Ligand binder design. Sequence first.
Ligand code: POV
Ligand code: POV
Ligand code: POV
Ligand code: POV
Ligand code: POV
Ligand code: POV
Ligand code: POV
Ligand code: POV
Ligand code: POV
Ligand code: POV
Ligand code: ACD
Ligand code: ACD
Ligand code: FZ4
Ligand code: FZ4
Ligand code: FZ4
Ligand code: FZ4
Ligand code: NA
Lengths: 636, 636
Amino acid sequence: PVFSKPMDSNIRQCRLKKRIFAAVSEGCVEELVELLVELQELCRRRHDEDVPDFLMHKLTASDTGKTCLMKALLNINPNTKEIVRILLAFAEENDILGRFINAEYTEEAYEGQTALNIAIERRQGDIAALLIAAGADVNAHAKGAFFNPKYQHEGFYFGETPLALAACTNQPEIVQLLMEHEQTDITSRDSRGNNILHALVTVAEDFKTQNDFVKRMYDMILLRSGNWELETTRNNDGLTPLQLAAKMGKAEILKYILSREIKEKRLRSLSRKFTDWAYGPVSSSLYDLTNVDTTTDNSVLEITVYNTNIDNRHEMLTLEPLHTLLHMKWKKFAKHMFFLSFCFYFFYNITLTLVSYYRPREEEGWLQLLGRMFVLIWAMCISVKEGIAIFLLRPSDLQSILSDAWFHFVFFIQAVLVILSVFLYLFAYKEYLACLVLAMALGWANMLYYTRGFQSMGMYSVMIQKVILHDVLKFLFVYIVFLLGFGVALASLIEKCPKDNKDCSSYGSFSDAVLELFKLTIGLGDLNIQQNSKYPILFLFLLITYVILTFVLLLNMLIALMGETVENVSKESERIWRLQRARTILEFEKMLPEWLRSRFRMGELCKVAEDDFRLCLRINEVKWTEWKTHVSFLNE
Amino acid sequence: PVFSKPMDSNIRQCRLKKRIFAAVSEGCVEELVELLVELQELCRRRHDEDVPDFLMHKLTASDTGKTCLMKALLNINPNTKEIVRILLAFAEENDILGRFINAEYTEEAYEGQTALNIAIERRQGDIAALLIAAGADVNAHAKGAFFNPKYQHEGFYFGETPLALAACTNQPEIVQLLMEHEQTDITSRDSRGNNILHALVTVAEDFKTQNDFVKRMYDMILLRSGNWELETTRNNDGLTPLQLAAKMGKAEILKYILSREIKEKRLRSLSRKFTDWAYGPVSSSLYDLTNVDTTTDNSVLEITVYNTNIDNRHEMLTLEPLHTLLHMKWKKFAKHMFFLSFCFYFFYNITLTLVSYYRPREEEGWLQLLGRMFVLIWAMCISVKEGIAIFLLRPSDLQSILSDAWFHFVFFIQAVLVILSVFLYLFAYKEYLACLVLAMALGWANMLYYTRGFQSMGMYSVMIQKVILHDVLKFLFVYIVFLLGFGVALASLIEKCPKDNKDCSSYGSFSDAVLELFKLTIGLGDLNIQQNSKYPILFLFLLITYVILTFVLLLNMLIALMGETVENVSKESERIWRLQRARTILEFEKMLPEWLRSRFRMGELCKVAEDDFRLCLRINEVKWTEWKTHVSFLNE
Ligand SMILES: CCCCCCCC/C=C/CCCCCCCC(=O)O[C@@H](COC(=O)CCCCCCCCCCCCCCC)COP(=O)([O-])OCC[N+](C)(C)C
Ligand SMILES: CCCCCCCC/C=C/CCCCCCCC(=O)O[C@@H](COC(=O)CCCCCCCCCCCCCCC)COP(=O)([O-])OCC[N+](C)(C)C
Ligand SMILES: CCCCCCCC/C=C/CCCCCCCC(=O)O[C@@H](COC(=O)CCCCCCCCCCCCCCC)COP(=O)([O-])OCC[N+](C)(C)C
Ligand SMILES: CCCCCCCC/C=C/CCCCCCCC(=O)O[C@@H](COC(=O)CCCCCCCCCCCCCCC)COP(=O)([O-])OCC[N+](C)(C)C
Ligand SMILES: CCCCCCCC/C=C/CCCCCCCC(=O)O[C@@H](COC(=O)CCCCCCCCCCCCCCC)COP(=O)([O-])OCC[N+](C)(C)C
Ligand SMILES: CCCCCCCC/C=C/CCCCCCCC(=O)O[C@@H](COC(=O)CCCCCCCCCCCCCCC)COP(=O)([O-])OCC[N+](C)(C)C
Ligand SMILES: CCCCCCCC/C=C\CCCCCCCC(=O)O[C@@H](COC(=O)CCCCCCCCCCCCCCC)COP(=O)([O-])OCC[N+](C)(C)C
Ligand SMILES: CCCCCCCC/C=C\CCCCCCCC(=O)O[C@@H](COC(=O)CCCCCCCCCCCCCCC)COP(=O)([O-])OCC[N+](C)(C)C
Ligand SMILES: CCCCCCCC/C=C\CCCCCCCC(=O)O[C@@H](COC(=O)CCCCCCCCCCCCCCC)COP(=O)([O-])OCC[N+](C)(C)C
Ligand SMILES: CCCCCCCC/C=C\CCCCCCCC(=O)O[C@@H](COC(=O)CCCCCCCCCCCCCCC)COP(=O)([O-])OCC[N+](C)(C)C
Ligand SMILES: CCCCC/C=C\C/C=C\C/C=C/C/C=C\CCCC(=O)O
Ligand SMILES: CCCCC/C=C\C/C=C\C/C=C/C/C=C\CCCC(=O)O
Ligand SMILES: NCCOB(c1ccccc1)c1ccccc1
Ligand SMILES: NCCOB(c1ccccc1)c1ccccc1
Ligand SMILES: NCCOB(c1ccccc1)c1ccccc1
Ligand SMILES: NCCOB(c1ccccc1)c1ccccc1
Ligand code: NA
């Protein structure tokens, strides 16, 4: 990144004020005392009306706003605490201690950063305790391009508050010192709208390491708060800390929140998992479904399934209510809607076939009327439905067209070519055969959409798409190099044939020469040596050189590259069809009306505590492997 | 190796002097005292004019120059220190202690080795302290074929000085004893021109192990020197210890020197990295660019990119100023010069194509004149530019023609065949078509040079070259064995055909028989059994035997060997295009004039200290992963 002005500067890029910053940096105590006396006497020699203002302009930098207190804290030495006790005592007789401890940068990239923001970051618990006990602001919002970047490489976002700075830098002794302070606003929201619990989700990691202080900071702040105000708070985008963990793909944080159970009464009401009974490996629990089920707009189940930015959707959709809601919707409507979508579309491809095969060749019942009117209606049903999904779609397709958004185009292109064949055949035109045949060939080719979501057949549609997009299209630029180079080369040697006998040279034009050289590449060629040219040996040299390069080397090079794609999909094949069915379920739920979706709703009302009635889900879990390993070491 | 004379010898390959060497070896003290009295009395029985000379010829070997003091130190026993104290006291009454402790080998392979060179190597800190306190030379240069070899298997190079012997054999207690000695010349240069810091680079290793004493010896000697005299010293080849680490490929040493930062004032001026400010994971530093940027002749960036001898160029070009200078040159001129080199060469291949396809067949505008004159100029621009690069190139091509120096020939051969086609077409000749077509086919084939340096397309040009050079050409000697063996075999059975009907046997000659047997190998053949010979079954046996060997076994054996090459390049594919672009940048910088290269220069003048103004580079680094692991264990 770049900021065009440093935070601290001690190297110059090629007199009372400049010596004070050169005294608080190295740690010269006896020099700093002699310099402050020279500035204490320099207040009254010309005026006594402006004492509190003139004392501040000689201790602050006029370009950044950095004070002499900030300069001592940016440069940590073992003589640091002695400098702070002198500078805070110097503002006592001048009565300027109120504005000296609450100063901030006036520069646009570090605006709002105070001396308390530096002392907590340098791990100075004794110095930060002296500032708060003197009048430092515990609610100072450090804005700016450095503290509020646009990406995670152009600064450092922690939450803009001193409570979020100690929480993100693993310092719980300062968090306990700030939460006991009665002027600290815990539920404060920064420029992003994030509170103390949104900012911990942002700095969290995606997987489980050895030390997880973010989960420890999440539990410590939430239980000492003792309310739901931090959890129901939404951002400027309208996201809770539960929904933010699903958006950014933090599976360890999303697992902890969504099965949080507190056994202690006076603290039990802050739970989302409620175990009813347990007997060995069998447990029965109640799970909160407040923002999880798809009854609100931006629900957690809708985020995780449609989150193409992240890599761990299979880890997050295996979690504790998310796998059961996804399974119960399949056994109620989504298996029925997938079977009928197969049946109405397989009947649609047969009717396209039997009107394309039995077309009126030269001369130009109730079941025949039932067939052709079904073609005109079902093609308009797809072109409206798939046309909305393309319009409601963003142009950054590198992550959505993996297996998902590729089918939204080919069902739409096939539906338009059926409709375009109607306008051509009826009016006056003969180009209907060019549109009806290509729609029928693409119509049968779209039957591989119904192989998706199954353990045995789900990986075949991914193998076809990933070979075309990642192996074949990047290999056309290697092969057209040799197809167009040798194509003009062999066509230039062919002499103009004497008048008759058009089968005297197959390479007699550039359009001819590309055809046979494509046949030598795939192996349907002919090494003809008749070939009436003035250079028979030179034609025979470039013809065999083409066969060795394309057929022997470049053809088997592509097969070795396509074979690496097939084995990579086959290793991930158990994770593919589980994510294919998960998107198929939620698209079928959006096709349902409101009166029918209300019958399909899961959940029952519970009595958690006094004035607490939330929507639950009873999930009977049995864990044999986790039980046998648990019992074994209690009696080793 | 071989030296034809040993250092120490105790085994004979099938009388006062020979008993002394047989006394200092085993450790006989009471025998050695009785032998020295017999030699003390043998000085005066025939002359008293030559006492200091005659006392030395009976204690030294006349063939090697080895003394009795060296013989006791080569044979370490627990009775070693008692022998040294007697022999050094024996030279006191004879007043020959000055030449007895400073003696050396007169043999050509061990010349200059003294008793101090042996005592430090055998780990004798007490014996080496007694020699220096008696008058031993601390600046004795041990030359010779053993101590100055030509390769790293024909001797032991350490630096030829006793200070470099204790530094390379991990003995810092003797290094501290030598650097406090006021006659020790630290900045001494041996026969190679190496000083104390060049010799540590030579004995260093390429990667990071558990114990790195070479980096510890580099830091200990440099900080106690306290000057830049050891760093600015160049060899006989003109290399600093910074440039020697880039030449020999020591990435651990080159990383330590190029980000050396000393926080301590009185020692800060020996730094090359200067951290300006740090706030969490974000750091801003200034890097020294004295011999790093390409403004001097033998710069570190020019060495590492063009160092085909080493295997770790990707590890060294990732380092701390080397990755930023390589990235800033791409975003200023090298991306523009690569795009226009694509555009002027793609226009050049079209104009060659449209004059080769539309040639005057039988009978023999301003845009047509603009095209053909562009061919005559652009072919002369390549033939001059690529002709210099072949002339300035060494004949040891096994490491430069991997992906790099192969393109310097094929752009040159293509440019000459365009020029050769002009002299043939204009004068009187008809062989212009044999040169224009082969230049046009090779001209389109050189378009894969512009796929280099990209993450998606950079590995394809390496896969084509490595399959030809390492799989195909070593398999021709396997296949011509079977092509020439069966080719004469099947042509010898073919009887001379009765007069007419030339299509009676396709194997009627050796030139004919190689053609169809090449077609059976690739799979375009015919198992014809008509074949008018006197041995129809014996012809049919050798024909099917050829198909099973070549098409079934030897063809798929090559495909299995080519497939191992493709998967090895595909695993290294992220390291290939980063090294392809790095050579493309520095070749474009050499094409720039001096006035335009001065505008593209990076760096600003800094004030490091008093009388210290060097060229810097501000690099804003952010390290999220290295910060989250660092904070986690400080508050575990
Ligand atoms: C303009 C357009 C408008 C469109 C109108 C639509 C909009 C309005 C829609 C309204 C619909 C209303 C909702 C549906 C409610 C029905 C309830 C039901 O029975 O569902 C059931 C399915 O029932 C079945 O019979 C499934 C049959 C087997 C399917 C096999 C999948 C393969 C499909 C072909 C692929 C071949 C692959 C080969 C290669 C290609 C649910 O499943 P289950 O059986 O209950 O689960 C068993 C568990 N249990 C019994 C314990 C509970
Ligand atoms: C997944 C998808 C896989 C498959 C998709 C692949 C699809 C590929 C399909 C290919 C089929 C090709 C059909 C050709 C049709 C005729 C063309 C023509 O007119 O040529 C004419 C000139 O011929 C020349 O001289 C060629 C010169 C072209 C210049 C090349 C620049 C662009 C190439 C960029 C590449 C470099 C990039 C480098 C990057 C590394 C010859 O004309 P004619 O034939 O003799 O006509 C007879 C005239 N008559 C009819 C009146 C008698
Ligand atoms: C890359 C891996 C390499 C190894 C693996 C190989 C497999 C992959 C390789 C793929 C490379 C593709 C090479 C195709 C060769 C075309 C031949 C040709 O020129 O056509 C004809 C020209 O016809 C025309 O005049 C109009 C052009 C129509 C050509 C359409 C062909 C398919 C296009 C793309 C299909 C997309 C499919 C996508 C499926 C995923 C032949 O000419 P003619 O009619 O005989 O001459 C008439 C005479 N005249 C001169 C008087 C005019
Ligand atoms: C090793 C892997 C094995 C398995 C994989 C296989 C792939 C790799 C294998 C490679 C092996 C190569 C075998 C080629 C077969 C030659 C056929 C021949 O003899 O030509 C002709 C002779 O014509 C002549 O008389 C002049 C010679 C021209 C030959 C040029 C062929 C290409 C040369 C090298 C190209 C370099 C390309 C390099 C690309 C990287 C045929 O003879 P005829 O004209 O029909 O007879 C005339 C009649 N007469 C008897 C009266 C005279
Ligand atoms: C006799 C012979 C004499 C020869 C005369 C020459 C000698 C004298 C020469 C003198 C030249 C002087 C130096 C150049 C100064 C220009 C400045 C510039 O804009 O550079 C810029 C290029 O900007 C572009 O225009 C790049 C366009 C895209 C290139 C894509 C690469 C693919 C190229 C084809 C591959 C196809 C592969 C397909 C398969 C093959 C630098 O990049 P950038 O944009 O700045 O980077 C963005 C960063 N920034 C904007 C934030 C800063
Ligand atoms: C990457 C590159 C890949 C591709 C490149 C590969 C390129 C290969 C290309 C190959 C094409 C070959 C074309 C042949 C041209 C004619 C030759 C000839 O005249 O033969 C004659 C004798 O025939 C014999 O008897 C052969 C004996 C040769 C001795 C071999 C020793 C050296 C081989 C060392 C090997 C062992 C080493 C062992 C180590 C393991 C027959 O002549 P004719 O045919 O009857 O002519 C008709 C005469 N007339 C015209 C007047 C009528
Ligand atoms: C998986 C769930 C299944 C979903 C529903 C699927 C069920 C679909 C079932 C029926 C769909 C058809 C209804 C469309 C009505 C119009 C038909 C038409 O075009 O007329 C044709 C009549 O038909 C024939 O005679 C064709 C005979 C070959 C059909 C092959 C059987 C396979 C498809 C069928 C069975 C598939 C069974 C699938 C499994 C049940 C014209 O034929 P003609 O007599 O020659 O007329 C003369 C025309 N001429 C003058 C130009 C020559
Ligand atoms: C891949 C794209 C580039 C293709 C190669 C381009 C590079 C070439 C670079 C330099 C070549 C320069 C010399 C050739 C010019 C004269 C040729 C000639 O006149 O033909 C002669 C022989 O015909 C032949 O068989 C010639 C063989 C071609 C030479 C290829 C070099 C070997 C490289 C192999 C590597 C394999 C290729 C690369 C694989 C890695 C004439 O025979 P004729 O026809 O019977 O005519 C009779 C009339 N006349 C005698 C009066 C004339
Ligand atoms: C990526 C950056 C691009 C860099 C610049 C690339 C731009 C290059 C643009 C133009 C290059 C041409 C300039 C050379 C001028 C001489 C041409 C010539 O020989 O005359 C030919 C005229 O031309 C034709 O009529 C040929 C038509 C087929 C061309 C196919 C288009 C692809 C290449 C072009 C477009 C590529 C576009 C690429 C993308 C922009 C001869 O044809 P004729 O009428 O039959 O004459 C009769 C002769 N006869 C009597 C013997 C038969
Ligand atoms: C690889 C390079 C070397 C190739 C093998 C060399 C080694 C051979 C070593 C020893 C062979 C010694 C005996 C052969 C001599 C007489 C043959 C004969 O006369 O033909 C007879 C039959 O023709 C046949 O089919 C015979 C089979 C060929 C013999 C191969 C041995 C089996 C090895 C298998 C291993 C596979 C090979 C190796 C694969 C690993 C006659 O039939 P005719 O033709 O119709 O003529 C009729 C007229 N007449 C009856 C009057 C005659
Ligand atoms: C507006 C039309 C533009 C031109 C049309 C371009 C693309 C659509 C046409 C074909 C694309 C798909 C072809 C089907 C072939 C293989 C995929 C099998 C289905 C699967 O993946 O399992
Ligand atoms: C003086 C001439 C001597 C004879 C010529 C010998 C060799 C040069 C000719 C051809 C070599 C290159 C051919 C191109 C074919 C495949 C490589 C693709 C480009 C790449 O590598 O990606
Ligand atoms: N057979 C249980 C596999 O789990 B399922 C699953 C697991 C992880 C991610 C997505 C889904 C599942 C499959 C179909 C319907 C509901 C859930
Ligand atoms: N919207 C018109 C057809 O939509 B359906 C559909 C079309 C293509 C892919 C998937 C579904 C459909 C959905 C449920 C039952 C029957 C058909
Ligand atoms: N995109 C960062 C990859 O690093 B680059 C790189 C890394 C190691 C070796 C060589 C280069 C790089 C790539 C292009 C220009 C400059 C540097
Ligand atoms: N020297 C004549 C052609 O050189 B250029 C060139 C040609 C082939 C490969 C690499 C470079 C060139 C360089 C920059 C811009 C345009 C062309
Ligand atoms: Na394999």
